[PDB]
Amino acid sequence: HWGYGKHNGPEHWHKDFPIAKGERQSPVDIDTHTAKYDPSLKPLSVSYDQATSLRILNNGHSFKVEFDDSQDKAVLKGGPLDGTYRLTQFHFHWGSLDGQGSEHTVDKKKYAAELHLVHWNTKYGDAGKASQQPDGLAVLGIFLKVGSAKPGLQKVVDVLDSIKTKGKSADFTNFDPRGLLPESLDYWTYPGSLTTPPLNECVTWIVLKEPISVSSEQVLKFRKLNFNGEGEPEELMVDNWRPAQPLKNRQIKASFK
Ligand SMILES: NS(=O)(=O)c1c(F)c(F)cc(F)c1N[C@H]1C=CCc2ccccc21
Ligand SMILES: [Zn+2]
């Protein structure tokens, strides 16, 4: 199936998913000098007070912390968005080395990892229906650099040994995603896509300028995960990032400067 290697990684995805060569693919390099400050953008509103995490899950490509999105709870609005987008899950992409791992880049800089908080536009009723619309999803992307530990991340890291392998899940309740946010909500935004198959062109990307710091020990725990299932040869889950794709007609807008 698809994955991140030589014979099934990103340069192969187009054969099963021809939109991989589409007009609004993600991620992209954010050229900060070219991004246009847009004084009409609004502050983002990230309203995570009542978020209810349910499970954390390893799917063989990443791991994802899930939320109960059956009620008007943890919502993203404002910024570039029209309407209300409800948080459904977050996940990460990361590298084998601290010098790579992010999907987006900033003036060609790669971060050690990238957090994706995925939200769906409530006007489409479900995340699945939302994924068929060109304004269906909004992903808040946050870069991770290696330095001091992020305390709010540790509950996630400490459960990973219980989900080492593809298909494992754990009861993951009362996790507060506010502990994963940097101080500043300054951002870049552009229209793009899922970064994994099926690569749907359904995402408004909102990429925060300010990275969070995680410790070397925290990211080493991500790198102990496996892309295989239990009882299969160990494949470390590392380098699960799609490289930057052509910007094509698009303009990246800045909320700041
Ligand atoms: N970056 S991503 O393509 O993985 C992503 C998006 F860009 C997006 F807009 C919505 C998503 F749900 C996902 N990630 C999930 C895709 C399938 C299930 C799964 C399992 C674990 C981690 C993430 C995801
Ligand atoms: Zn992602």
Which tokens go with 35?
């991004």
Q: Are 114 and 104 in contact (CB under 8 A)?
A: yes
Q: Cis omega (within 30 of 0) on the bond before 27?
A: yes
Omega prior to 246 cis, within 30 of 0: no
Entry resolution (Å):
1.2
Determine the Cα–Cα distance for residues 235 and 1; give it in Å rounded to an integer.
15
Identified catalytic residue from 1, 61, 104, 119: 61
Q: Counting atoms of ligand 1 from 1, which one is nearest the CA of 137? A: 9
Q: Which of 117, 97, 112 is nearest to 143 (CA)?
A: 112
The answer to whether residue 61 is catalytic is: yes
- Which residues are within 8 A (CB) of 60 and not within 5 positions of it... i.e. 6 or more apart? 3, 166, 167, 227, 228, 229
Contacts of 216 (CB under 8 A, 6+ apart): 98, 146
Distance CA(242)–CA(102), nearest Å, equals 8
CA-199 nearest atom, ligand 1: 3
Residue extents of the structural domains in the chain: 1-257
> How far apart (Å, rounded) are the C-alpha atoms in residues 106 and 51?
30
Q: How was this structure determined?
A: X-ray
- Provide the b/e sequence for 12-32 (b: ≥16 CB within 10 Å): ebeeebebbebebbbbbbbee
Q: Which amino acid is at 190?
A: Y
- d(CA 220, CA 237) in angstroms, rounded, equals 11
